[PDB]
Each structure stands twice: as structure tokens, then as C-alpha cells.
Structure 1
Amino acid sequence: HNMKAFLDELKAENIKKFLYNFTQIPHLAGTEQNFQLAKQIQSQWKEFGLDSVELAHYDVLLSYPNKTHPNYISIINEDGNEIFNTSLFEPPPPGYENVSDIVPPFSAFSPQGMPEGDLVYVNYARTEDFFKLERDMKINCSGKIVIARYGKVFRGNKVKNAQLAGAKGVILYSDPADYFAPGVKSYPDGWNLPGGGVQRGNILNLNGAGDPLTPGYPANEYAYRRGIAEAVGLPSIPVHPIGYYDAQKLLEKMGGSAPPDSSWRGSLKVPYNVGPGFTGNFSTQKVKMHIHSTNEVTRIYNVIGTLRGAVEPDRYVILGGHRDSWVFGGIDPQSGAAVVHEIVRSFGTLKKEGWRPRRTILFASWDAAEFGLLGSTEWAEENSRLLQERGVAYINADSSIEGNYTLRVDCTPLMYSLVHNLTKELKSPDEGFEGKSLYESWTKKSPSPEFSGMPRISKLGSGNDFEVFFQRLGIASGRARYTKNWETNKFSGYPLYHSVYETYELVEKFYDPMFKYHLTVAQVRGGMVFELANSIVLPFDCRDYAVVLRKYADKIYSISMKHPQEMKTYSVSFDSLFSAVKNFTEIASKFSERLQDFSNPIVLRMMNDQLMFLERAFIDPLGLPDRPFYRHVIYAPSSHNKYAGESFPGIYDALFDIESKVDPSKAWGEVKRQIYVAAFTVQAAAETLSEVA
């Protein structure tokens, strides 16, 4: 009973069977189908040998289209005749044309409305796209309907940016430039997005809050709920997503200004004119949205499985991923959930033979992730005191594959050495690397930009269920999956993301026919959990944090140094931050020596608690400015793109666009304040590794 016994028990054929099982019908959050799947998972986890398996339910704000009053968009003429209508549903894939309960495409949490107006095209609707429009092109989005292509940033940020530019509605679409890889066929004949395909997804800006109605507290049976007008993160203008056949019909008539440059042009045979409005002949025509979706408080269910630790049952290593899907969830999330299921089964086989992990392992099937990470966040709000004092690590397990090229890992620096060592012990599943380690194939295909002979590991961003554990609670977190070649593939994520076409067949035929990539991912996620839960000394290397802190401090300093006159005028010094980083490096190095050099379980557990609380020490209980649920001072989701991680976010946001601020004294004061906060937090985290007395 060692890690190799655990790894060897995992089977590609089991993951395949589970994935097929989890993807035959839709499992939309808050629906009966998804409750039944929760009960099935609960039952099988018990069968598999877990000590306890419970449902934790919450009543949270969800959003659904109105079944009898469909959402759509029109081009309307001067008389008010609707001369073109967008689709009411995606053409269903072969053999699913009689599946019921496929939710039509919609933007979850859109308010109702029927705004009518002239179009402005805003590229990806990024902060810089709006800068370019308003500041350089002098185009005013006020009272216009904005059309934006999906890609580059989280769609919630797009909607916020449009709303702040004064738009009265947003139309999101998938451009073939971003969702149709050259030389591959459309689904069902290949893995590309067809013209009728549409990407679902919520457009909230929760900033870590969880259920919009109950920020701070679990949405239990006696919860006090905010009124809708005070809910967190809801958009104020209607929003709806469409495919590129429909987008072409909306864009082909566009007039006004030419696109400023080629980075504004997608692949449709249209000019990509910014607008506002249509060219000469069609200038009396307008665009009309019809959105009738409703928000409603709906019950959701997490499955929580427990495998009690033999020696430290009060230390938790968590493996969690969501179970709710937009439609069939062939990739997102069931390719991850099938892997979690096999990992539980494997741990349970060992448990039936008398083994227990040293520490407790918790397994989670989260609900309502698609609606804003609601299930994981409510559960963590409920259990925050247990998680704060006992949480060793959180390993996420959403989509196992988004490509077939190489490994992708995003994690805290505390897990870098764990990940390097583990991948050196795993077999590469890649063609041309048979008999070579996963470390070797991963390092060759995705070299670290900083270090020779190391692989790339990215910062954690957000848009997934580790968010509450890492950026709210300060629990060391990581995730891993197979991914595409990010050098040669210029499209975003995978084309069929959140569309009806994301099916079991998509995975089995095009992504992973042997289920070898899924198996590799099961080994990486499961092996990380195994080492975290069983290693005598927690497998965290604090010296890896010291190295990245220096890199982030150099980076934030170089950003500020674009304004040398203001740094002089306002006496802006990074000296304290570099001093704190230097101290962290020195103290971490001394702690590592002590960790090498001690039969005494109090010293050990004292040392394991210093390792466990180190991530915790980066939490500021006052949170970041106007984002009280982002409390980690080193990492937060980018204020311009929730998916991307930003380092020293408090300083970054204080410097961002600072040359445009009206009161430079005040703005540079706030930069200095954020420098102080970061230097202090780094020094305080360093001091948790000093001798305790």
C-alpha cells in the first residue's frame, strides 16, 4: 500500500465507462436530472468504500430561459417588421435530436428586456477595446447595442465593460477566427464549432461572493436573502449569445467607421465596421433583443465524501470538481468528474484492504459551478472555520482535457516541487515519448520561460471551484489537465465549449479515444492528493514561494517605473517590498534546513502546521479594495479578466491606467498604500516560518 498501488489501480476503461454514464442526458444545475445524478454519485461513493457520503444542499439564485417565451434577436425595419431572427436552439447533434430538456443558448442572469437600437462592434469587449473606441476612435457606446466576439477574457468582464460604456444590451458571438481551427471539420465530423453552435455561460461579476443573495453566509434554510436590487454581481442590461451564421447576418450590414486595425477583424466575410448602425441603404433598420429569462432561488446539491485519516483525521486534503453541466458536459465537467469517480474507486479499493491515508481526504461533487461557482462557495462559507484551521490543500477536477498535446498545471508555488517530482515518476502518454516520463514530455513541449529543463506552471486564476479555497480562504490549491499546443493553436480554449455539441462522442472520437490522457490526468490529480494526504512531512517547498515573490516584485516595480517623474514627485519606493521578499527568502531557507534536520511528532506537526498555514498567511482579512472575497495579497483574479491570475493585484490595480486619473496625488497615495500592505503581508508570512518561540 503505497502510491504505486494507488496509481496502478486506476484504469482508462473505467474513466471511459463513467464518462459515458455521466453524459447521456443534460445535468443542468437545479434540475431533477442533476439531483438524480447527485444521488447516484453518493450511492457509488459509499459502494466504493468511503466512510461517509452526504448531500449538502443550498437554495441559491439561478437563471433560466422562459420555456414559453423564447429569447431571440431581430433586425427590425422602419415599420417594425422583424426581417431576420436569430435561432431559437442549436441544431441538435446526430442521435440527440429527440433528447428533451436541452436548455437553449442564453446568458445566465441576464435581466429581461426588449431594447431596440443601433449596433456598435467592440471586438472582444476588453478594457483596451473600450479604451480604443472611446479614447482613440471617439465612438460613444451610450444607448447602443454592443456586439462583441467571445474570446480572450471572461464574458462577465465584457458585460461589465459594456455596461460601464453605457450600452443598453450586449450580443455575444463565437467568431470562426477564435472557434474554428484551420483544416478541421465542424462537429459531428471534427471538433470545430458549426455556424449554428452557441456558447452558453453566466455573465455575473460575483468577485468571489457565491450566491448573489447571501454573500458571506451559506444559503441554508433560514438564510436572510438580499432583495434582487441589492444582489451581488447581476448585469443591468440584457445579454444573449449567438453563433456565427447569425452573427454574420447582424454584422454584414454594419456602417460607420472602419475597424481600427486587423486585430479587430475576425474570419467572417464582413468588413468588421465598428458602427454605430448600418450602411446607407439599411440605416433605418435597427437591432432588437427579446430576453425573458428569469432568476429564481433553486435548490442545489453537493456530494461530500469522507475518507478519515488514520493519524491526522483533523487535516483535510480536498479533491473537488463540479457535476452540473450546460447540456451534456462531455468535456466540461464530466471528463473531470469521471476522473474523480475513478480516483475515489481506487482509494476505496486500498481502504477495503485495510489501508487509510495519514490525513483525511474529502471528495466533492459541486453543483451550480456554471452559475458562478455557487455550490463550492456556499459549502466553503458554511464550513469556513473547519477549512481555515484544518485545510491542507484543495485539488480541483473540472475538465480533464481541452486538447491532446501536453500537460497544463496551474497551482500555488507551494506545490511546484510536488508536481515536478510526481510527473518524473509518471509515464508520458504522448506519441514519440514512449518509455519517457511525463515530466520529460511536458518539459519538452511546454518549457518554462524562466528556467532551463523545467516545465511551465501557471498562476491560479479563477472561473473555477478552487476560487473560494485559494483567494478567499488561503488554502494551497492546484489543478491539472491535458491541453492544446498554445504556440501553434491561436483559437481560445476548445471550440465546442458550453455548446450542445460537447458530447461523449466528441471526447471518444476526437480528443482521447484510448482514454490515455484522462488516465494521465487521473494519475496527476490522484497522485497529488495521495502525496498531500500521506506524506509524513507536507510536500510543500516554501523556497519556491520566495523565488516567485521576487519575480512578481520585479514585475510590479517595472510597471511603476513607466512613470519615473511621478515616482519622484510622490516619493514612491518599492524598498519595503523588496526588503520583505529578501527576508522571506532568508527565513524560508532557514526553515527548510530545520525541516531537513529534526522521531519528535510535536516538532513535525508544529512544522506541518507552519507549512499548512503559510498559504494562509497571505490572506488579508480586510480583502482587496471593493472586493472583500478576494483576500489573498499575492494573487487575485484579474479585474479585467476573471479567468487570469494577477500578481500583487492590489498594487497592479492601483497602477492600472494611473496616467488617466484626475487626482494624481490621491492615485499615487493609493499605490504607496498598496505597496505597504504587500510588504507587510510578505514579511508577516515570512515570520510564520521563523522559530515559534
Structure 2
Amino acid sequence: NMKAFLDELKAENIKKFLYNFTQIPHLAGTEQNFQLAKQIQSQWKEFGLDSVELAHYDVLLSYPNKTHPNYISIINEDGNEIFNTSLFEPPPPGYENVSDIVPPFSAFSPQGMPEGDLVYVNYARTEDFFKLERDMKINCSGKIVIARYGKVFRGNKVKNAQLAGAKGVILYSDPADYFAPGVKSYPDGWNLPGGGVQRGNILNLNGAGDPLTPGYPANEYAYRRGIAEAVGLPSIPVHPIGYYDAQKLLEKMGGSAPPDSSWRGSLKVPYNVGPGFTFSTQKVKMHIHSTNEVTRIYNVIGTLRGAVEPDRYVILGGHRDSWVFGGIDPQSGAAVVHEIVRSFGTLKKEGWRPRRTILFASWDAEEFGLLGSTEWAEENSRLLQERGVAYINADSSIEGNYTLRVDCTPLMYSLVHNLTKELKSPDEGFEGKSLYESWTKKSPSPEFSGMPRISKLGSGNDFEVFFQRLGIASGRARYTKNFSGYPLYHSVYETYELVEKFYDPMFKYHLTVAQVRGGMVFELANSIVLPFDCRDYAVVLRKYADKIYSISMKHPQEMKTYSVSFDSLFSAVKNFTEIASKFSERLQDFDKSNPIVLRMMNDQLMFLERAFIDPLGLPDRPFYRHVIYAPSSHNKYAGESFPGIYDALFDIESKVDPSKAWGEVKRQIYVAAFTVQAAAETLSEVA
């Protein structure tokens, strides 16, 4: 029973694991990581799992040339290099030791050394570029863009700048976004020092996994494409800096005023758009010499076999590779997984077994484009779609200590509300009250009324293949701060210390997340009828149908000129509601003793998410096939609904051929409509 499962999870053990997991750096593709993989394997065996496998792949990674450093210079009249950027972050107290920490870099930047005139662009979000080029009419072509971390996935900014003719991109972290007021820098607080630099990859893989083998696993015989047709390589070099060097590049900034205060961080400078320097005169030069190279990577997979339905897969997965020590990202998740596995292996040993099979993966190479988990899905896709019940993700557990944060598919809302109601909040001041209670109090849904917010699912972490390509019901949970991240995210300062001292001394937030996570696994893996409520879907679907409808009405002139009708979507959506009522009625009324009828319904429940998948995929993104959600085309971290239609509606006034554009909005609508209906009828009586 569940009560048992939970009681067995101990905070102390988590501390133990997190400490063990973050003494040395753990970069994808390095021996340190191969060795940790070898370790997780044994202790998982030891904790009593039936089988623990390594699965390895040979994929494209990316590194800095050790003997020939990346950096930014400023250059005078005859390229005297006046100023240079750091070559590494000042290491935290007690890691001179730190034998080799990769220097900052943007993974997969093309090689290059371009020169030209900074133009500042803010976040390099779509609208900034709109603001720049439609109003200011400042022109990015030929220039070097410097932009600031925060807001949207860094791969989006580099794609944007590229679109806008740029020839280089420099990212920096502005205290504006990474400096909580009144807290002190590491080692003494948790604010990011002006020395540190957010590492991270900049690919736009859009779901393909290893860029050389879209569609198939990158195993021994896998045919690989030319780096020249690689999926999602930028063609302009990119590099990141802390706010000290930043300041030094920002401070001489020419051309216009920031078109407004929304464009200005807390660096003491003009934040001038540009281009040029005021030093007229002086110019910027990047030095990028990283190389890309096929490298081998290692996933850890441990089966805990089902006793009743060994052919139903519940999957708990998180990544193992870090940019540096990774005290928060990923090892605070990893630690939690570990205590979870051990706790299961414990009941198992007491002679207990789950109704369904549970799978535990330590993923590899997350930081380089969700490569580790993806190739595995590509290899096992058939077994996953005919058997995958649900996937729970397990990256960082805390990124803040203020409240819970959950994203998931509507089919888990009910289970998540029930489960959080059966758990103690560990918030200062809700000792005594439930986790549903604190969470609801602190974080209340827009969608109303007495309801904790739960978010959509975009991409940006390892659940993406499983929900967006395959249609397996997915979800995640972690503790958050009151997209930009936390200040010391993906930097040398993410250390075990960072957690013990400042985030969760008690380890009570870890162990809450360890309960939401293992608790969801547990329910999903063991409960006689699947925890899904097909009705919640019927709810959000009608909200979403409204949202998209409102958007279109921004243009009723056209809507009339072209007979743009949402009746089909609403019609489809109504039918869904109706069928799910009837369905759940039936779900109430049927002797749980009849196993065949049971299995038949859980199949209806299980394959329901699968019903929102189009084999053709969304336009231009073949590996994004959920019709209801995909990653935002403007920010991959953010999920969007009816992406097919939103994307067609987006920025539509700017299109030359309005009849063709509006035609495609219609096509998109008619695909949504049919897919909602088609899904619905999976819930209808089977004969």
C-alpha cells in the first residue's frame, strides 16, 4: 500500500545522494559520466530492481577547443584587441581541485570569428525584433546581436537573430533578471556573481533528437547525415558572458534610446539599441572555435516488472549529465529518483510488486538537446506506443522554495489534486495544513476558482519525446520561486553547497517533491483503474477552443471575406464533452471482477492521449504531432494549445497573399476539429 511507500522515503538519504552525485563535474560524453552510469546501474540492481540496463548511442555532441579558447574582444582602428571577456568563471571556494570544469560556451555554435557593430535587441524574442525592425526600423542585417538571457529558450533567440540577417550572437545574464534584490552573491547568497555565465545549447532540433539521425536510433549501424544537413544547426556563432564583461560591451553603445523602460536591466548604462558604439570607431570580434563530434552516451534503464499487467509501462525518468557539478540541475532530481527507486526495491524485497511494470531511466545528454531520452524513444517507439501508460519527468526538484509547480496533461489533473490533498505541506506556516492547501493558496489558477494552477506542456526537458511525438500521457512536478530560470542556473556555482545552505537545508522540499513524484508513479502503476479523467480534457478543450476563437476575431473583416467558421471545432468539442460523460458513467458501472472488460477500458483510457497524435505531424515540425499542444514556436519552454491554428493565425496581417493564409487557417481548424472528434470516438462504445 501507498502509505507504506511514502513512509519509506527519507530526506536524509536524498541529502546523502545529492552529496554523492555532485562532487565532480558530469558532462555528457565524458568518463566521469560513464562512471556515474556504471554506479547507478549497481545500486539500482542492489536496491532490488529485476533488471538494470545500459543503453548507449553515438550522437553529435559539441565542445570547446581546449588549446584554443573562445572569447570576445573589442578592436580599435588596426584590430589592437583592447578588451577581452573572461575565459572561465572564478571557481567557488574549495574547487581549485575542480580538475576540469568545461569553460562557458554555447554548444554547437558554428566556428567563426566575425566583426561588426553591436546591436542590442533585448531578449531576442520575436516582438523585440518586431519593435526593432518595424518601429525603430533599425536593421539587424550584417550586425552582431547581443541579447540577454531570460524569457524564452536560448535556441529561439539565436534562430531569431539568424532570421534577422545577424552574423553573430552574444548572450549575457543581466542582474535585471538574475539578481534577486537584497540577496548576496554566491558563495554567500544565491545571486549570480558578475563573473558567472549561463551555459547551454542552442540547437533548434524541434523534436528530432541527435541531429544526425532524425527518426531512427543512433546505434552502431545507423546511417548518419552530413553535418551540412544536420537537423537544427545554427549558421552564426554564439557565445555567453557574465554581467561584468557585459557592461564593458554595453557601456559604449551608439544609435537610439531603448524604445522603452521594458528594454533596460540594472546595469548602469544607456541600454542603447545602436547599432555602432557612440569610440565610433571601435568594433566587436568573436572567436569561436568549438568542434562538434560524434560521441557515445549512456542511458540507464531499470525494469520493475508488473505482476498483473507486465505489458503496461509506467515510466519515471530524469537526466544524469550536468554542465558543471549540477547540484541543482539535474542532480537534485536524480537524487530524488534514487531515493524513490530504493524505496520501491524495498517493498519489492518485502515481497510486493506493482500491478503494472515501472521503468526507471537515468537519461544521458539532456543538456545537448534532449538527445539521450529521444534516441531511446526512437528505438523503442513501438513498445512505447502500444504499452506506455504514462511518463513522469524528474529533472530539478527545487528551483525556489515557495510553492509547488506542476505541468501535465489534463488526464492527470484529478490524480494530482487527490494526491496533493493526501500530503503534508512543508511550507513555513502550513505545518498542519495539506500540500493541496498551501499550493492552492500560493499559486491559484487563472481558470478559477479554488484551484491550484497547473501548466501546459511545451518542450524544454526529457518528457518531450514521450508527449509531443508519441502521445503518452506525461507530467512533472518541482518546487519553484515566487522561463528565465534561477540565478545560478547552468553555471559553476550550482553546487551541493548552494542547496544545503540556501535552498532547502532541511531537505523537506526535496522530500515533498519525492512524494508528489513517487506518489504519481505509485498510483499510475498500481491502481486498478487508470487515474485518468477524460472529463478534465473535455473541460480545457472548450477553454482552448475559446482562446483561439477570440484570437481570430481580432480580424472579422477577413473572417467574413473568407467564411472562416469555428463551428466544426465547437461541434467536435461538444461531442467530446458528451462522450466522456457517458464514458465515465460506464467507468463507474462495470464489475471490476471482469478482467477482460477492465483491460478493455484502461486501454480506452490509456490510448486516449494517443488519439491526439497526427502521423503527418504539424506543419514544418514532423516530430511534433500532438494536435492539442506543441512547444511554442516563439519559446520552446512554453506550451501552446491548438498550435497548428495559432501558428497560422500568428502575424497574419503581414502576409502577402491573404487568401492563401486564411485558407491555411481554415485547413488548420478542420484538422483540429476532426482530431477532437476522432479522439472522442475512441471513448465511445467499442461495438
Which TM bucket (shorter chain)? over 0.9
Partners in 1 of 2:351 and 2:678 — Cα distance?
A: 42
Aligned partner (choices 591, 599, 603) of residue 609 of structure 1: 603
Instruction: Report what 2:492 is aligned to.
Output: 500
Q: CA deviation at 1:306?
A: 0.3
The secondary structure found in structure 2 opposite 1:296 is strand
Partners in 1 of 2:449 and 2:222 — Cα distance?
A: 53
Partners in 1 of 2:458 and 2:441 — Cα distance?
A: 24
Q: In the TM superposition, what are the counterparts of 1:312-461 in structure 2 within 5 Å?
A: 312-461=309-458
Q: Tell me the alpha carbon deviations over residues 149-189 of structure 1, each in whole angstroms, 9 at most, x when there is no partner.
A: 00000000000000000000000000000000100001000
Q: CA deviation at 1:98?
A: 2.5
Partners in 2 of 1:148 and 1:452 — Cα distance?
A: 39
Q: CA deviation at 1:462?
A: 1.0
Q: In the TM superposition, what are the counterparts of 1:580-659 in structure 2 within 5 Å?
A: 580-598=572-590, 599-659=593-653
Q: Tell me the alpha carbon deviations over residues 249-300 of structure 1, each in whole angstroms, 9 at most, x when there is no partner.
A: 0000001111100000111000000011101xx0111000000000000000
Aligned partner (choices 549, 555, 577) of residue 547 of structure 2: 555
Instruction: Report what 2:22 is aligned to.
Output: 23
Instruction: Report what 2:464 is aligned to.
Output: 467
Q: CA deviation at 1:101?
A: 1.4
Q: CA deviation at 1:603?
A: 1.1
Partners in 1 of 2:99 and 2:648 — Cα distance?
A: 50
Q: CA deviation at 1:448?
A: 1.3
Partners in 1 of 2:507 and 2:295 — Cα distance?
A: 35
Partners in 2 of 1:306 and 1:75 — Cα distance?
A: 55
Instruction: Report what 1:7 is aligned to.
Output: 6
Instruction: Report what 1:120 is aligned to.
Output: 119
Instruction: Report what 1:148 is aligned to.
Output: 147
Instruction: Report what 2:662 is aligned to.
Output: 668
Partners in 2 of 1:321 and 1:603 — Cα distance?
A: 34
Q: Tell me the alpha carbon deviations over residues 544-563 of structure 1, each in whole angstroms, 9 at most, x when there is no partner.
A: 00000000000000000100
Q: CA deviation at 1:79?
A: 1.3
Q: CA deviation at 1:435?
A: 1.5
The secondary structure found in structure 2 opposite 1:661 is coil
Partners in 1 of 2:324 and 2:166 — Cα distance?
A: 30
Partners in 1 of 2:656 and 2:447 — Cα distance?
A: 38
The secondary structure found in structure 2 opposite 1:660 is coil
The secondary structure found in structure 2 opposite 1:363 is strand
Q: CA deviation at 1:211?
A: 0.2
Q: CA deviation at 1:440?
A: 0.4
Q: In the TM superposition, what are the counterparts of 1:31-430 in structure 2 within 5 Å?
A: 31-279=30-278, 282-430=279-427
- The alignment status of 1:688 with 2:682, answered yes or no, reads yes
Mean CA deviation greater in 477-486 or 116-125:
477-486
Q: Tell me the alpha carbon deviations over residues 216-250 of structure 1, each in whole angstroms, 9 at most, x when there is no partner.
A: 00000000000011000011000000000000000
Partners in 1 of 2:422 and 2:511 — Cα distance?
A: 14
Q: Tell me the alpha carbon deviations over residues 354-387 of structure 1, each in whole angstroms, 9 at most, x when there is no partner.
A: 1000000000000000000000000000000000
Partners in 2 of 1:500 and 1:115 — Cα distance?
A: 28
Q: CA deviation at 1:13?
A: 0.3
Partners in 1 of 2:259 and 2:157 — Cα distance?
A: 19
Partners in 2 of 1:494 and 1:511 — Cα distance?
A: 11
Q: CA deviation at 1:451?
A: 2.1
Aligned residues: 685
Partners in 2 of 1:494 and 1:265 — Cα distance?
A: 19
Partners in 1 of 2:581 and 2:361 — Cα distance?
A: 35
Partners in 2 of 1:354 and 1:497 — Cα distance?
A: 42
Partners in 1 of 2:444 and 2:254 — Cα distance?
A: 45
The secondary structure found in structure 2 opposite 1:426 is coil
Partners in 2 of 1:116 and 1:534 — Cα distance?
A: 60
Q: Tell me the alpha carbon deviations over residues 409-433 of structure 1, each in whole angstroms, 9 at most, x when there is no partner.
A: 0000000000000000001000110
The secondary structure found in structure 2 opposite 1:565 is helix
Partners in 2 of 1:446 and 1:600 — Cα distance?
A: 42
Partners in 2 of 1:260 and 1:577 — Cα distance?
A: 40
Q: Tell me the alpha carbon deviations over residues 515-565 of structure 1, each in whole angstroms, 9 at most, x when there is no partner.
A: 000000000000000000000000000000000000000000000010000
Q: CA deviation at 1:143?
A: 1.0
Partners in 1 of 2:274 and 2:491 — Cα distance?
A: 29
Partners in 2 of 1:684 and 1:493 — Cα distance?
A: 38
Q: Tell me the alpha carbon deviations over residues 35-92 of structure 1, each in whole angstroms, 9 at most, x when there is no partner.
A: 0000000010000000000000000000000000000000010111000000000000
The CA RMSD over aligned residues, in Å, is: 0.6
The secondary structure found in structure 2 opposite 1:688 is helix
- Name stretches of at least 5 consecutive residues in structure 2 with no aligned partner: none
Q: CA deviation at 1:452?
A: 2.0
Partners in 2 of 1:368 and 1:315 — Cα distance?
A: 27
Query: TM-score, normalized by length of structure 2?
Result: 0.99
Instruction: Report what 2:481 is aligned to.
Output: 484
Q: Tell me the alpha carbon deviations over residues 548-600 of structure 1, each in whole angstroms, 9 at most, x when there is no partner.
A: 00000000000001000000001000000000000000000000000000021
Partners in 1 of 2:364 and 2:275 — Cα distance?
A: 41
Partners in 1 of 2:396 and 2:624 — Cα distance?
A: 24
Q: CA deviation at 1:436?
A: 1.1
Once the two structures are aligned, what percentage of the paired residues are identical? Answer: 100
Partners in 1 of 2:451 and 2:551 — Cα distance?
A: 27
Partners in 2 of 1:270 and 1:448 — Cα distance?
A: 38
Partners in 2 of 1:70 and 1:390 — Cα distance?
A: 48
The secondary structure found in structure 2 opposite 1:83 is strand
Q: CA deviation at 1:338?
A: 0.1
Partners in 2 of 1:453 and 1:10 — Cα distance?
A: 30
The secondary structure found in structure 1 opposite 2:367 is helix
Partners in 1 of 2:206 and 2:229 — Cα distance?
A: 15
Partners in 2 of 1:449 and 1:429 — Cα distance?
A: 24
Q: CA deviation at 1:665?
A: 0.2
Q: Tell me the alpha carbon deviations over residues 94-123 of structure 1, each in whole angstroms, 9 at most, x when there is no partner.
A: 001221110000000001000011000000
Partners in 2 of 1:226 and 1:568 — Cα distance?
A: 47
Mean CA deviation greater in 255-264 or 477-486:
477-486
Partners in 2 of 1:641 and 1:225 — Cα distance?
A: 29
Partners in 2 of 1:629 and 1:379 — Cα distance?
A: 15
Query: TM-score, normalized by length of structure 1?
Result: 0.99
- The alignment status of 1:527 with 2:519, answered yes or no, reads yes
Partners in 1 of 2:175 and 2:387 — Cα distance?
A: 47
Partners in 2 of 1:187 and 1:379 — Cα distance?
A: 37
The secondary structure found in structure 2 opposite 1:658 is coil
The secondary structure found in structure 1 opposite 2:653 is helix
Partners in 2 of 1:357 and 1:369 — Cα distance?
A: 29
Partners in 2 of 1:538 and 1:451 — Cα distance?
A: 26
Q: CA deviation at 1:485?
A: 1.1
Q: Tell me the alpha carbon deviations over residues 179-200 of structure 1, each in whole angstroms, 9 at most, x when there is no partner.
A: 0010000100001000001000
Partners in 2 of 1:177 and 1:674 — Cα distance?
A: 39
Q: CA deviation at 1:22?
A: 0.3
Instruction: Report what 1:489 is aligned to.
Output: none
Partners in 1 of 2:11 and 2:97 — Cα distance?
A: 30
Partners in 2 of 1:100 and 1:632 — Cα distance?
A: 44
Q: CA deviation at 1:660?
A: 0.5
Partners in 2 of 1:690 and 1:601 — Cα distance?
A: 19
Mean CA deviation greater in 477-486 or 259-268:
477-486
Partners in 1 of 2:588 and 2:655 — Cα distance?
A: 51
Partners in 2 of 1:274 and 1:200 — Cα distance?
A: 25
Q: Tell me the alpha carbon deviations over residues 614-637 of structure 1, each in whole angstroms, 9 at most, x when there is no partner.
A: 000000000000100000000000
Partners in 2 of 1:629 and 1:7 — Cα distance?
A: 37
Partners in 1 of 2:266 and 2:482 — Cα distance?
A: 21
- Name stretches of at least 5 consecutive residues in structure 1 with no aligned partner: 487-491
The secondary structure found in structure 1 opposite 2:683 is coil
